[PDB]
Symmetry: D2
Subunit: 451 residues, 4 copies
């Protein structure tokens, strides 16, 4: 071990570690979850520290040699070379200051190897505060997870569901309302519904981006921008947009709102919770569709991970959905409980919203590729049940009367025959209606209003 110090005194630190005294104190203060920042969060802190040093350099506030060493070290952090040098618990000081110091200290150590002396706070934290940096890194990570990862994953799941809507356009089957047999639909129409739920999910994510992409950087300790250049925020955002290509990143509309609250994470988590609600309905219908092979609905077969496969992907999707709903409740709880100039629930809110992004992204692509794409429909079976359902007797009423339509439905169900065969077996053809009229009235695909 080695001796390091801070404004509170002296601290023993692992002789080898890139982090310094403040990080070590936080390792000792917060042994709670045993989990630290995720790859996406460390990448965002690296991007931000690089962009700050670039702007400080551009404003002649920081020596070029120091800015260059920060930019190079921060690039190594953003690329993933130093993940082991972020040991601090998620459950740390609410502003995320410990993690901010962790980035500063690691950057200084990297620079030192390369012969450059950086002061973690006077150089690596120049023009910044703990209060504006950690939420900025959080909103970069959440915006990147929304734009670069979740939206493309939902688009892949949308396309797989729309492809089934088209493939199954004429696959007529029983409708089901209240779980009870209803007038006909097609599997295609039901999948067009699932596709619309996912398309609307993408619209929900896009609608939250004008506020999710807002960054606190430049507001310093309390939102006033004291101890930063007046244009720090607009300059740093311009660097982050050019480096990431995320045009959704923007300076906060109000510098006080951006630090006193995290309402943009609450808003975004509501979009994710809505997707989790949509995915629950889609996955539940699909596993019920596959149920059997004998005693269930046996409408479709899920691909094996023939008719006896456990619906394991639907199970993963509905478990992810449960986790997103829980995470959402934790996010709203932290969101509400800010005071005055700072919301001090940022590390916990960050853990939860980034996890929700990751789970939905990963499960959506698996569901699309390994469940949706390989579903096969029991087409003739579905049509035979639709043609045999008491639900389709209604259009006979005007030809044969209510009482006889009811007797047809009862006999068809008891004898396990089609409506068409029962109407013939009861001797109703000629008297009340012709074969041509019967085939028009009982055409189940026409009844589903599909072609």
């Amino acid at each position: 071990y080695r001796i390091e110090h801070d404004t509170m005194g002296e601290v023993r630190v692992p002789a080898k570690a890139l982090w310094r005294a403040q990080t070590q104190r936080a390792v000792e203060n917060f042994p709670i979850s045993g989990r630290g920042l995720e790859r996406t969060q460390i990448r965002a802190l690296g991007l931000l520290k690089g962009a700050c040093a670039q702007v400080n350099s551009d404003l002649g506030l920081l020596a070029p040699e120091k800015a260059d060493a920060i930019i190079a070290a921060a690039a190594e952090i953003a690329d993933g070379q130093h993940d082991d040098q972020f040991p601090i618990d998620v459950f740390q000081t609410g502003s995320g200051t410990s993690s901010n110091m962790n980035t500063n200290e690691v950057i200084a150590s990297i620079a030192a190897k390369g012969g450059v002396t950086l002061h973690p706070n006077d150089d690596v934290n120049m023009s910044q505060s703990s209060n504006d940096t950690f939420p900025t890194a959080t909103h970069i990570a959440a915006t990147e997870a929304a734009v670069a990862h979740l939206i493309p994953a939902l688009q892949q799941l949308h396309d797989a569901l729309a492809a089934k809507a088209l493939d199954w356009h004429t696959v007529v089957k029983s409708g089901r309302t209240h779980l009870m047999d209803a007038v006909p639909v097609t599997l295609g129409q039901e999948f067009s519904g699932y596709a619309r739920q996912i398309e609307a999910g993408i619209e929900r994510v896009r609608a939250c981006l004008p506020r999710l992409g807002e960054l606190a950087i430049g507001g310093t300790a309390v939102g006033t921008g004291l101890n930063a250049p007046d244009d720090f925020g607009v300059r740093v955002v311009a660097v982050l947009v050019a480096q990431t290509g995320l045009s959704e990143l923007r300076t906060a509309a109000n510098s006080f709102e951006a630090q006193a609250a995290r309402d943009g994470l609450v808003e975004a988590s509501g979009a994710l919770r809505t997707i989790a609600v949509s995915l629950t309905k889609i996955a539940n219908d699909i596993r019920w569709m596959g149920s059997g092979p004998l005693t269930g609905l046996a409408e479709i077969q899920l691909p094996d991970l023939p008719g006896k496969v456990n619906p394991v992907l639907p199970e993963a999707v509905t478990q992810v959905a449960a986790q997103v709903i829980g995470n959402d409740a934790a996010i709203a709880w932290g969101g509400a409980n800010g005071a005055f100039e700072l919301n001090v629930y940022i590390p916990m809110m960050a853990r939860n919203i980034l996890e929700s992004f990751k789970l939905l992204t990963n499960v959506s692509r698996l569901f699309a590729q390994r469940c949706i794409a390989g579903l096969t429909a029991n087409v003739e079976h579905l049509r035979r049940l639709a043609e045999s359902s008491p639900s389709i007797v209604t259009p006979l009423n005007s030809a044969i009367g209510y009482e006889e339509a009811a007797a047809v439905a009862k006999q068809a169900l008891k004898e396990r025959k089609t409506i068409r065969q029962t109407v013939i077996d009861r001797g109703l053809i000629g008297d009340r209606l012709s074969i041509e009229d019967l085939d028009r009235r009982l055409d189940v695909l026409a009844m589903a209003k599909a072609e």
Copy 2:
């Protein structure tokens, strides 16, 4: 106390009641909460039945005498004249079919008083099903609640907060982070943050309207539109837009999504939940600011309705209720099956209550709390003059090196920057007292 004849026997119905047998059976079946539809929901059911009758008349499917009687009876319901004719529990069949039939029966009874005979099903429910009517009325009610009521109430609260942000632009005070003394801010800056939260709230509600305003009407039993005209939905929506002025009402993008799911309600509830989260921070800050007057922060004085912060308490309690309602909505939203989500009456109760609570408490908070707040200006300046200071504004006078030495000695000896500058003998040609006091001025440090 009259008796009626249902195809499972004899049903006694109160004599002044306009509902008939199906509604009276639903009253007997669902004695669960003892609360029925709200007036917003009754109004929306009246609007939908008048619009359907109009379109069935325009298409020649319904005789103009019957259409006229349905339209007149529907206008009375939409006008609030029959809010006592809807006795069915919220906790009813999950399609809302019972309340749909309640509307059909009341219109039939209103029509019969003017000498016209209507069949509740064949005439008043023509081209509609048991499953596309109650979700349509729910979305009409929620869209009206968002556009005509909530957004203007939030704008009133925004304008009250923004007016204080301007009044108090130079009312300097101490910042607080982690509840600890921080560098100066103004009371106006804090109120500018509150105003932005409510402005972002209005943006959040606006953002959900393209989906909240989607109506299922025309989809009939399963979403296929069987037994409705092909253009029923588009024609009914046009009548509803014309009659209500709500341009946000639209036909569903997908007629299956619009009946299998209520995801539009779940989305909208998320916006309301975010507003509840914002209101909690605003209300909490305001009651803390008003706390004391000896044991608290005593920064502001709330209007009296030793003043208890009763409107901040009402706001925070409303916020709690919107959070619970939101959880119930998401639970019902997720539990659809195949062609129908059967949680509609519960989801409707919860999202329409959330709209109403937020509307009503926002206007009360704006008018009877925010507008009348008074700042304790001299107290707030004394707190600002006790905040930590920084040496940065001395750099141009004593240089980076001396400024850094001032900062170190101030921390070590637990002194202010100001006293440390004086104690180090730094007052001279490089730095007058005037210049020290101008550089460290607390309102300049708030950068207003």
Copy 3:
């Protein structure tokens, strides 16, 4: 439209209103939800005011003619005769002081009609504060809801489920795991599981009562009992226990915890949330088992209120959703007390008391109008159990797993019993008698019932 003169001006009060100026101001201050206190919280406020007057009379603090007038007026409130005299919104001052004052004013107005003058504060609120009364009434109402109403309702549902478990003891059917076919169970075994869920629900409600029944009365403004007799709490609780028979009512273990927090309501709501979770599983299984009549599971028929919509399972799952939401609102209020007082009490009381009422009413309806009248498709369920690929495993030691897999495939394709398939494939002989086959494919024995 009669008129009243306040400490702050004039107030118009409805003529047939028994409330006075403080209530009317609260009506004007809080037009938020349009919903006031429930019948159970009005009753509890009457109970509490009667017992407080009894004790103030017993200690010689209150003239007995005034105490008698309060006791008579409070009894009318407790008996539900004045449910229309409580117009204040739920969303009021967070201590429930407005509703406290509403009760004091209504009692004074009832007393006035019988010739007795009571000061709402000095007489009806004697020894009490604005902060220990409303939460005491909340905990009386919630404890009475748990003990007199919800437990007996849950016991009625338990007994209905258990009676089905016994009637269907030998009704063999396919198990289902992951929604896929599995080895046999009986409908009786499944209903015995539902019954245990409800019996465990009753255990969960019983387990929260030591803390749900804790009353703050006597703690006055901050929990110290300043301006009350030292034994006010134990005296008032003893009168409430004697009058109501509710032995679960008790003084708070800690008078500060009883006012700074409402953790007993949060605890109780968790038990109600667990019951809602159990009822969701039971109601969902029942509506799935009734699905059809052609394209669903068609295991049972629900009674009308095999084409019946499952309307009571829909009522039960909707109520369960409301209980879950209410539970989230209660926890939110519970967490956000400050120092000597939690000021979310009216919101918490609304939510907890609604949850109790919905679960009570829907459990009785579910037991009586759904569970009691279910009918099983007994022969059909046995035919599917006897035709399932899941039951060929006990053939392996006779014919090997490869021929057992061939039997399973042919039984499913030809829609025949495993028994008939084994006979049709010519496997009856020295390796397998008809009697040994019938032992190996005895699906009811595979379910291992009593």
Copy 4:
């Protein structure tokens, strides 16, 4: 690397991996969270497989050399020696069958290193199924977390709060109701309330154990017990209780309820949710009482744990109350996830077990760890600003009430008005208005205005 053969083809497995083909398929099937089972779940799966092998040996179903090898391998897993051999995602098949097979495969691989051949299914999974094992291990883990870790941690916090309540028995201060000035209390009374919240928290955990400790073992695939000995569950429970000392473990009252539902986890989460609600109140009150030191309430001082800021060099922050309130938020979210999973079983199996297990065991761990840290690094070192607190109590308008019977409520109200206006003590204001004489001696004033007696401390 090193190659293997499934029934569905050839699988490559890391070289130092003790898992086999089924585990490697699950790794490829569920790349969702990148997080697998925690230490406590792995331990429980080890305990369970050892107890099962012991019972199968006792009943003469499993050869003793095979049982001894499973027992030895399972003890290594339960001792935390193999925490890196469970790579499967939490978000797996909802019965937890993947993690069950992972345990069977790791045990077979440990035994093979000692020259004994075990079939992961026919030996290590003997008398068990893919559905009654993972929920049994979940309930063992949750019961152990409640009894061995959380209750002791909560007791430590209770004792720290109760010690402050006693040290501060006479530390008089103004009450606060609605955040407004109220009549006197002691800091000791407030801390006795916080102590009771934590003690009630322990009572809530104890009250759930009769159902949390119920185990599905012996139920097999659908709860019937088919393909297992009639008494397998009571025999496995007897072994677990004897080896662990966990008296709360029991065989389920109903074998169907035990597999079709996880209501015991929903119930236990409710107790943890209530503790999070109590901890929120305690931690919020403490950081408010520590607020300032110049612009806040400055009632107490929290022990300094790390530098608060670089811009404000000497500012120190209530970091432990922030950790506690963040944990509480996580426990409330976790609780919502668990209830959601608990409600959505179907027929003979609830298929939300891995997700419900992750959330319930995380809530136990966060609450245990943060409770100990709050007790040792915050509560134990709090110091009260006694003279500040007494000065405010002695200047409070709220304390004029006991003057009423001497000078009347109108004159008492004038004393309060004046004191508050002129920033004086009530005692001094009563003097500066000449009221000491006939109706009121100087010692009679000091008896009426005794702020500690007004707090009515036992």
